[PDB]
Amino acid sequence: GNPVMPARNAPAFCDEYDRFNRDVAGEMNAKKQQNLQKKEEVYAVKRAEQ
Amino acid sequence: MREVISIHIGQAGIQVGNACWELYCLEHGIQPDGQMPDDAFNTFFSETGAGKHVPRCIFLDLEPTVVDEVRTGTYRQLFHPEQLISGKEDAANNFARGHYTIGKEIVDLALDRIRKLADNCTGLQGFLVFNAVGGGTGSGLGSLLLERLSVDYGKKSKLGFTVYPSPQVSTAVVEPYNSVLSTHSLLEHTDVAVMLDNEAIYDICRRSLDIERPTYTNLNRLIAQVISSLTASLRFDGALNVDITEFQTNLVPYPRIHFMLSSYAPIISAEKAYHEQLSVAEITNAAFEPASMMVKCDPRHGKYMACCLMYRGDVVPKDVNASVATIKTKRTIQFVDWCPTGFKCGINYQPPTVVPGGDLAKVQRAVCMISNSTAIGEIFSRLDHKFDLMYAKRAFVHWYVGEGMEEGEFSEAREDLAALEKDFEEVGAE
Amino acid sequence: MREIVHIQGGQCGNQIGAKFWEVVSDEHGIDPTGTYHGDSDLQLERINVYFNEATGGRYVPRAILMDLEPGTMDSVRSGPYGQIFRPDNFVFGQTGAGNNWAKGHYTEGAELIDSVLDVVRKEAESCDCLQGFQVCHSLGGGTGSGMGTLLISKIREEYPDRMMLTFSVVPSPKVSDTVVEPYNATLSVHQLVENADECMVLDNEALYDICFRTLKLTTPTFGDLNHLISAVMSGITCCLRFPGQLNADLRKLAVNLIPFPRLHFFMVGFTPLTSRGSQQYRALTVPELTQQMWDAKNMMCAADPRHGRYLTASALFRGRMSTKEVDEQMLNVQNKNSSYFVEWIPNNVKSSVCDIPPKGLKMSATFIGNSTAIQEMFKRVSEQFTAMFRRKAFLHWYTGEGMDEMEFTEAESNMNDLVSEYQQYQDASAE
Amino acid sequence: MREIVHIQGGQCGNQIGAKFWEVVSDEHGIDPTGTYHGDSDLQLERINVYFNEATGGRYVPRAILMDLEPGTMDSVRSGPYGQIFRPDNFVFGQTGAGNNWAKGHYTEGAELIDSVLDVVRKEAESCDCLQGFQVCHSLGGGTGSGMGTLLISKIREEYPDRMMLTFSVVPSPKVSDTVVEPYNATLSVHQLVENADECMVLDNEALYDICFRTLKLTTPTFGDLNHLISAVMSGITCCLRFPGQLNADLRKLAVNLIPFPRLHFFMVGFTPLTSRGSQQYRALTVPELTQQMWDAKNMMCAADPRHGRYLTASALFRGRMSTKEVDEQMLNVQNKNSSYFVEWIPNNVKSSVCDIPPKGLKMSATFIGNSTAIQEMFKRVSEQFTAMFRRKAFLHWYTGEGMDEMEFTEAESNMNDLVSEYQQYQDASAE
Amino acid sequence: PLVLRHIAGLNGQMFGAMRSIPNSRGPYNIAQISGVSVILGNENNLAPQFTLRGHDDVITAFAMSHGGSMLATGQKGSNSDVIVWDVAACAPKYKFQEHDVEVATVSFSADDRLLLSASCFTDAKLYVWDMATGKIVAKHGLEPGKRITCSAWSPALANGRAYTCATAAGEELALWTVDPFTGMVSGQKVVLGTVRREYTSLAFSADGAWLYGGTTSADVVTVNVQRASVQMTHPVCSGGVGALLLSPDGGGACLVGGRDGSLSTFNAAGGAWRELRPFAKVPGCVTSLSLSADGGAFLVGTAQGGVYRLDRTSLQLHTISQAQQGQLTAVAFAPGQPEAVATSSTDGSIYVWSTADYTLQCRVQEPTQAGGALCCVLTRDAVISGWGDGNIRCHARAAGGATCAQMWMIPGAHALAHSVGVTALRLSNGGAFLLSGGMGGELRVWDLRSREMAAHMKMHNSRIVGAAVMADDKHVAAASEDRTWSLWDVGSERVRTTWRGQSMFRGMAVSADKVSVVTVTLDRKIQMWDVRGPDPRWTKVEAHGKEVGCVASDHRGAAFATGGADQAVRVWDWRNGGEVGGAACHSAPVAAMAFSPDDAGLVSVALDGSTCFWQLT
Numbered sequence A: 001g002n003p004v005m006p007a008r009n010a011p012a013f014c015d016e017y018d019r020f021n022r023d024v025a026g027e028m029n030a031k032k033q034q035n036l037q038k039k040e041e042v043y044a045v046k047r048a049e050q
Numbered sequence B: 001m002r003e004v005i006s007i008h009i010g011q012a013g014i015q016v017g018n019a020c021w022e023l024y025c026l027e028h029g030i031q032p033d034g035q036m037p038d039d040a041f042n043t044f045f046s047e048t049g050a051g052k053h054v055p056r057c058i059f060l061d062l063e064p065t066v067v068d069e070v071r072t073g074t075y076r077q078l079f080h081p082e083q084l085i086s087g088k089e090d091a092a093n094n095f096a097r098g099h100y101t102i103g104k105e106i107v108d109l110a111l112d113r114i115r116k117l118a119d120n121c122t123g124l125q126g127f128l129v130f131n132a133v134g135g136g137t138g139s140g141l142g143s144l145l146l147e148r149l150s151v152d153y154g155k156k157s158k159l160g161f162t163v164y165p166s167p168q169v170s171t172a173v174v175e176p177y178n179s180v181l182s183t184h185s186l187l188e189h190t191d192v193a194v195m196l197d198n199e200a201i202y203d204i205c206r207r208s209l210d211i212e213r214p215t216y217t218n219l220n221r222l223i224a225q226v227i228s229s230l231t232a233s234l235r236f237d238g239a240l241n242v243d244i245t246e247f248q249t250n251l252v253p254y255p256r257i258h259f260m261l262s263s264y265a266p267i268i269s270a271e272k273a274y275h276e277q278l279s280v281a282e283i284t285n286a287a288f289e290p291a292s293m294m295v296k297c298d299p300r301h302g303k304y305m306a307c308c309l310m311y312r313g314d315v316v317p318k319d320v321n322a323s324v325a326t327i328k329t330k331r332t333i334q335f336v337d338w339c340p341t342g343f344k345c346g347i348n349y350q351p352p353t354v355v356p357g358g359d360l361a362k363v364q365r366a367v368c369m370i371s372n373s374t375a376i377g378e379i380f381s382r383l384d385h386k387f388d389l390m391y392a393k394r395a396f397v398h399w400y401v402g403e404g405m406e407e408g409e410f411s412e413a414r415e416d417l418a419a420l421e422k423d424f425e426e427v428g429a430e
Numbered sequence C, D: 001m002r003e004i005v006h007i008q009g010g011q012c013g014n015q016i017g018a019k020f021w022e023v024v025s026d027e028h029g030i031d032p033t034g035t036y037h038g039d040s041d042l043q044l045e046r047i048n049v050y051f052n053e054a055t056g057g058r059y060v061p062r063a064i065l066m067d068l069e070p071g072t073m074d075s076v077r078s079g080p081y082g083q084i085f086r087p088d089n090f091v092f093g094q095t096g097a098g099n100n101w102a103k104g105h106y107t108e109g110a111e112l113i114d115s116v117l118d119v120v121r122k123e124a125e126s127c128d129c130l131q132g133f134q135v136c137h138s139l140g141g142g143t144g145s146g147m148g149t150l151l152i153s154k155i156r157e158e159y160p161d162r163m164m165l166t167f168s169v170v171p172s173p174k175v176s177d178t179v180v181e182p183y184n185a186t187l188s189v190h191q192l193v194e195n196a197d198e199c200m201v202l203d204n205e206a207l208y209d210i211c212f213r214t215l216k217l218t219t220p221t222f223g224d225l226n227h228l229i230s231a232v233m234s235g236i237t238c239c240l241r242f243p244g245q246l247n248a249d250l251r252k253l254a255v256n257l258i259p260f261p262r263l264h265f266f267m268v269g270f271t272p273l274t275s276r277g278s279q280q281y282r283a284l285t286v287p288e289l290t291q292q293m294w295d296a297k298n299m300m301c302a303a304d305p306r307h308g309r310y311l312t313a314s315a316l317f318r319g320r321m322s323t324k325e326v327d328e329q330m331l332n333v334q335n336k337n338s339s340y341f342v343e344w345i346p347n348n349v350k351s352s353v354c355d356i357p358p359k360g361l362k363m364s365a366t367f368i369g370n371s372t373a374i375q376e377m378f379k380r381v382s383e384q385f386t387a388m389f390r391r392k393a394f395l396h397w398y399t400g401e402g403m404d405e406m407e408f409t410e411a412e413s414n415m416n417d418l419v420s421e422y423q424q425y426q427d428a429s430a431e
Numbered sequence E: 001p002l003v004l005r006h007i008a009g010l011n012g013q014m015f016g017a018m019r020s021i022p023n024s025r026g027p028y029n030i031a032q033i034s035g036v037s038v039i040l041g042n043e044n045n046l047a048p049q050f051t052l053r054g055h056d057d058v059i060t061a062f063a064m065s066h067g068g069s070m071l072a073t074g075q076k077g078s079n080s081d082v083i084v085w086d087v088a089a090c091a092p093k094y095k096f097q098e099h100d101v102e103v104a105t106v107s108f109s110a111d112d113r114l115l116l117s118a119s120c121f122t123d124a125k126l127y128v129w130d131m132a133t134g135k136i137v138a139k140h141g142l143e144p145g146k147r148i149t150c151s152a153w154s155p156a157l158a159n160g161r162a163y164t165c166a167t168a169a170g171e172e173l174a175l176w177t178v179d180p181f182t183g184m185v186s187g188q189k190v191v192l193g194t195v196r197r198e199y200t201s202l203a204f205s206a207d208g209a210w211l212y213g214g215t216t217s218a219d220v221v222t223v224n225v226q227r228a229s230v231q232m233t234h235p236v237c238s239g240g241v242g243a244l245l246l247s248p249d250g251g252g253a254c255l256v257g258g259r260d261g262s263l264s265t266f267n268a269a270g271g272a273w274r275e276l277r278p279f280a281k282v283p284g285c286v287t288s289l290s291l292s293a294d295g296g297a298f299l300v301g302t303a304q305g306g307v308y309r310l311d312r313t314s315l316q317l318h319t320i321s322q323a324q325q326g327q328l329t330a331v332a333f334a335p336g337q338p339e340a341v342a343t344s345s346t347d348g349s350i351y352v353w354s355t356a357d358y359t360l361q362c363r364v365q366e367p368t369q370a371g372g373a374l375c376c377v378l379t380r381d382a383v384i385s386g387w388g389d390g391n392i393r394c395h396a397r398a399a400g401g402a403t404c405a406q407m408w409m410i411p412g413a414h415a416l417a418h419s420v421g422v423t424a425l426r427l428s429n430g431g432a433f434l435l436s437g438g439m440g441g442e443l444r445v446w447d448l449r450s451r452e453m454a455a456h457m458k459m460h461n462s463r464i465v466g467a468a469v470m471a472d473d474k475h476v477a478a479a480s481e482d483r484t485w486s487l488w489d490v491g492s493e494r495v496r497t498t499w500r501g502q503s504m505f506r507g508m509a510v511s512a513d514k515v516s517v518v519t520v521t522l523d524r525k526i527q528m529w530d531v532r533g534p535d536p537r538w539t540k541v542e543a544h545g546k547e548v549g550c551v552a553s554d555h556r557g558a559a560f561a562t563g564g565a566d567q568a569v570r571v572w573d574w575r576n577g578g579e580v581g582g583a584a585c586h587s588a589p590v591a592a593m594a595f596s597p598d599d600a601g602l603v604s605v606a607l608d609g610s611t612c613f614w615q616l617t
């Protein structure tokens, strides 16, 4: 295959969907919300440990 | 009471009659079978004891194909089989063929059926003759039929919605010839002749309806809408009722000058509809726009002599008065110095019904502006040189001569069109 | 209900007519047996223009086959559609004309012409209304040209008002098949000018050029040339047989094409002719059809229109198409090539539209051009005829059949006069 | 709706163009039969830039293949995507140019150039709006360089305002395939300087180095190099074909890149090029793409930018990305490597963002650098050309095809002047 | 779980689409070609059928082995493969991928030992394969572009050094002497002699040396094989020939079909005069002729999709099955009646079938210029269909097999100079009006009593496919090519919704509850939507291997089917998703389908013409 063509199961790989999405702000907002929730959960776990 | 007999001569006449009768059936609720599940249909239809409505129409053609398309198509049970009259040989774009040799028996039978149809009418507002100036069938047979109608019926108002050759674009070669012949014929017979140009209607479809590929179906649909707006006051009541008899009284200053420019407004597709207010003033301005005119003839070159406006739908006399005042005060629109009023406004409460499969959208208001203006001499000026350019070499003259015509007929038609030109110049000048 | 009586003359005429009837039957869904198997109402709607109904569902073509040798019509009968024709319409002699127009027009055609006119009259009287007769044949062949001209004269005498259409295969410019081609062509053109109302000039070398350049075929036999001729022959009359958005019969075409009665020779072309390789890669659009139609390579006549001037031109389009598109395309062509169009005719285009395209094609368009380019074709034929007649080569063959030498001079004078008329309207100026 | 006409020249150009059209058809979801199987609206939204619609759903590439020997085109046609191209767009001669620029430009290129321009005009007139032409070919080959320069000159004459983009495979520094590569390159560069609006230099040895070091491909075929070139050729115009957060067409790139008309040569590179082993290990971020992009080994031209000074540099990014992140990365690169950037231009970066990444890649970025480093490559080509021309080795073939010896001197002078301009702007100081 | 009950398909264009299996004591007496696959079924209907599917595109050539093997050939896709099928195994036996373009024809030797395969394009090869292992002779070359129409083998001259194969290509006949011991092919062109006819079928005599070729000219040309020249010609069956079979016993007889449905018995002896007199007439154009039921029937096929059984002892005519011909576009069920199923097609034909026995209840036929029946709606006594010309024709439903009478027609319902042809017709619940969707995205509600237009509703800018009316004076569209779908109101005013996805839609259905709406996208994703929700509730990715083209819904709201280009119909729970049951039986992409009004029953149609009936229990 084409060397430029990424292999499956790679950080570079994206399906045909998630390509042509053309939505950056929504993805960043969703990732920000997920990171905030994960950070709150981590703080809760550390609080429980302390 | 207000019956109007419709005549459709030639392929163009029949193909605009298809749209016209589809529109009338849709407006009156008449199913294509012939009957509806009042008395407003009496203008266009006569009801039988069985409840079935037949149109008071006559489809005349020397070619069998066009009429057989109707006989086999959707409205085969609606129209009368004998009312559809078909010839055996086409006129072959020969005015002489359609007026002197083939058309004799066909037009005699047409008068027979027309008399039978008029026998079913208590009153008779007039005739609506739809033909094509520029074809042997439409020109020759139509001229002969109009002459016979003038001879026998007499003072009945015959409105000829003629389709004239476009300035540059065309489909025929002897079109200037038979156009000049037909114009000479109908200058003295029709009461009100409405000029239509395929180029102008194509431009209307391209610019207003955004149709990059307009066709005869679209053109005929627009013409049908114009005629329905014209006849709406006969079938539906409204403030400022206008009649067929009132047209030529309020629009024809002199008998020779009876050719009419027609403009419909608004012309918008469904996608572009309901995006603008479409007020009475705006649609009146659009109707008076030169581009919306259904003839390739800029009104700015000439001067308006009369303008009859037919409004349909939610139209109020206050708004129509304001719009007409703005039109009069506008400098671009110029009326003749000898006509102070020059306006015949008539409102109707029935909005124009939308044909399924048409590109026109459902609009609560509509304007049909039919005007007498001296600018219309421009189209005659174009045909007068397109004719003589061939006539110098006597091209295609043998074809017309072979069916019982003379060079004298061509000379007389050319001289008559020149007289029409000079009459237009005289009325335009102070 | 406007009937057409088809006649085939000579070997070339018989083969062309057989191919044409094959194509028309395929278009109307008629199998070689006469029965209808098309599954479409419009196909049977106007089938009476060409066919008559037998006792059953059989449809017999209104075709009349002529020859002086029986082998050609034996081949015609044994061909794919040989069994549709009524056997009574095969009129044959026993000794063929030896490529001798004199034999085919005076000696041997005289006996058979009585039977030919009898069959023609029988076919015409059965017709409800007759648009006219179409005769397919070849100029430059003995029986073909001779009997065709004689029959055209007889039918002109009998039915003056009825239309006469001719598909004549003029001898090719470069490669000539028979030696006596200039003689036969010169004699036949004199008859066609006087009698034929409408005539189409076809050249085998133009057909070879178009089928090798556009169709890009490798081994084009006479069948392919006959197929192109059949396509044009069908497309000219498809407006009679099918509904049209703007229909136009043969008389309408003749009226809008012929400016003056003697100038009735036309070069014809069919679009779209696409090679098998590029069939998908092309696009069927009205501009594309017009562009291919106005190309000189599309012309089936040897003469290229660039040298001459288009007196008139009819274009019969077929398919679901925009009349606005058609009119705009042809007006644009006229404006762009105003040099090639006659000035004293403001509109040189007769556009017709038919609702039914040919089988397999979404869109099609046949072209009939009356231009002064055919002047060079006639000039070349006369250039050969004069060279042969100066030394009177092969003149004794025609002289011994009982036609005067002065007939050659009269025919040459008439043909030169036609050339002069074409040149006069080529270089005529307005006002 | 801003169309581009693709042209392939010579064997290398034809192979590169075939690979490029395969890549574009894959990216737009077009199967080798031309039907759309792409499963996205945006793919068909702007497919008209490179393709035209056939009779059905087939899409015909707007490509023109030009060659003097039919073998390369036969191989391309037999290849996987050989059937999409219109057969009429294959313009080939019969005797190939023996690595002779004179044969490809004067003797044999003269006859075929008429057909080539005919096909080019037919393709261009069909375009509603024309951005311009892109010509892929190889310097240092007979037919390729010859008709490449000839056709570029002709298209410049016909369409002056329309864009010209060139992908020229300049002969590689160390390994040379043919002997007359310096002659052909010297003759072709002189033409490109005058004619081509925008020129893209590619070297086979630079491609081998990049695919052996970054891709860690050990024995790279020519197909691999062609496919890298194809990725660059797609990415340069993806802003035309897809919606972008900050789009930039070819003319915008040219305006932002070319400071002075003669300095229109660029080195290009593609990101992210990852070896198969490290594909899971590499994480794609805009800083990572920029770090790989500004690396000298990433450039597909043999000249390394460290020696020269970046006059300008455009980077077309592709994918859902932060404009702040991209702009910060490029500004930081400029600040860190200010020694390598020309001082009298405050911002040497034209950053463009398209929202549609290529197939398989989450993000990508194509780089286009105008730097004075190209001076050393032209210097090497002149070093070989002068050495050969001093002894006039192999000169007699070019002489016998009909160019004066003075053409070689004029071409060498023009190339030396271009080198001088590049050095001038390399060592130019502000104020 | 989906259970396949019956497949109705027949490639009516092919000459020899259906063929018997001689001396077939077990099941699967007949074999038909319908598309990608082969329907191997019993002579009597209402019996299980097998689907020999190993191809990727349409089948171009079908061959019997005179009892023992079937063979089908591919088309395009660079995989025009000759695949040999076994009667007992019902599995592929040999796969010859040696033709670069579609295999023009294929035939089996009279002794079932040799196999002739002929291509036409860019590699024209008469491959002869042995029943054991592979090929015997490479080719003889032919010429590209010469359409090899048909082929036959000589029963005689089987001495191991000779095998006479007759091949008709256009108007050319060629006899190919094949030495399989040496693997040589010698091709002698038959001297025509003014005999130019297109040969539909070829058949040698019992003793050879006389090859009968049936032509489109209703003639059988008898050619002397020994001299390789046309000997004589006789008219046989007015209409054409189609199928030509050797008489089951015969003196020198040969059964001839015709395009008129006539079946006659032509004998070479008997003089030049024939005076045609058929012994049996079938409805349609005969394309296949065979013998089965222990040689008691003639098993005559039809170009109209029909298979018929003609008794030999008493000439009794019994139909077997009917197949809708063309690309089938819509399936409709009567509002309450599960016994009648309406199937439309791109060909102007609509078949109303009795699902109990798959017989043709009635047929609606329209001319080709009337477009194609792109949508259909069934009524207790009416068939309403929307065509490619934009017109909506309603025909009087008939019974027993007859051409229906057109009661009425809405003309120009959807034809606006930019898109013609109404799609996705729907009827109001209980029956009040008719919802229609144009090719350009205009929704139109039509009264039924007066056929008058009641609502024109134009917001969607592309093709409508999958419109559906809710339970109360409201409706919703699918609007393919613009990846959005909107719920509307009959008061000519959109009620919010207008949900946009990311990929273009292909079909949309509404569940029994008025809140659940299923859409299918070309991304092979099934999207579930709640009318009360602004986002789809969930989406199932990769529902089919290829694009999904149609979606259905049970009237109880429990399950909904999904058919795609993978030729497989699946069933999914409305709320939980998952696969209730899936199966691939159509020999084409599935274009449309309909659930039965009751629990059991699903009727799906394919692009080739295959109608598959399914039991859901």
Ligand SMILES: Nc1nc2c(ncn2[C@@H]2O[C@H](COP(=O)(O)OP(=O)(O)OP(=O)(O)O)[C@@H](O)[C@H]2O)c(=O)[nH]1
Pocket (backbone or CB within 6 Å): B009, B010, B011, B012, B013, B015, B016, B061, B063, B066, B090, B091, B092, B093, B094, B098, B132, B133, B134, B135, B136, B137, B138, B139, B163, B171, B172, B175, B198, B216, B217, B219, B220, C245, C246, C247, C248, C252
């Ligand atoms: N506006 C409009 N004009 C049309 C239409 N159809 C035809 N025409 C015009 O009508 C002219 C000819 O009409 P006809 O005389 O009826 O043609 P025909 O039926 O063949 O009869 P002849 O031509 O006289 O033999 C043409 O020049 C067209 O310009 C139409 O549908 N709409």
Ligand SMILES: Nc1nc2c(ncn2[C@@H]2O[C@H](COP(=O)(O)OP(=O)(O)O)[C@@H](O)[C@H]2O)c(=O)[nH]1
Pocket (backbone or CB within 6 Å): C009, C010, C011, C012, C013, C015, C016, C096, C097, C099, C138, C139, C140, C141, C142, C143, C144, C145, C169, C177, C178, C204, C222, C223, C225, C226
């Ligand atoms: N297009 C075409 N031309 C033919 C055919 N057969 C003969 N010709 C040409 O017709 C010309 C005259 O031959 P022809 O008139 O048929 O001979 P005749 O029948 O004895 O008079 C010859 O020059 C041939 O080239 C044919 O089947 N098709």
Ligand SMILES: Nc1nc2c(ncn2[C@@H]2O[C@H](COP(=O)(O)OP(=O)(O)O)[C@@H](O)[C@H]2O)c(=O)[nH]1
Pocket (backbone or CB within 6 Å): D009, D010, D011, D012, D013, D015, D016, D096, D097, D099, D138, D139, D140, D141, D142, D143, D144, D145, D169, D176, D177, D178, D204, D222, D223, D225, D226
């Ligand atoms: N990247 C790449 N380079 C090539 C390819 N084919 C040839 N080349 C190189 O291009 C240079 C010029 O060759 P070319 O112009 O194609 O030869 P011509 O067609 O006879 O003029 C040669 O030195 C080759 O090394 C290819 O497919 N890909």
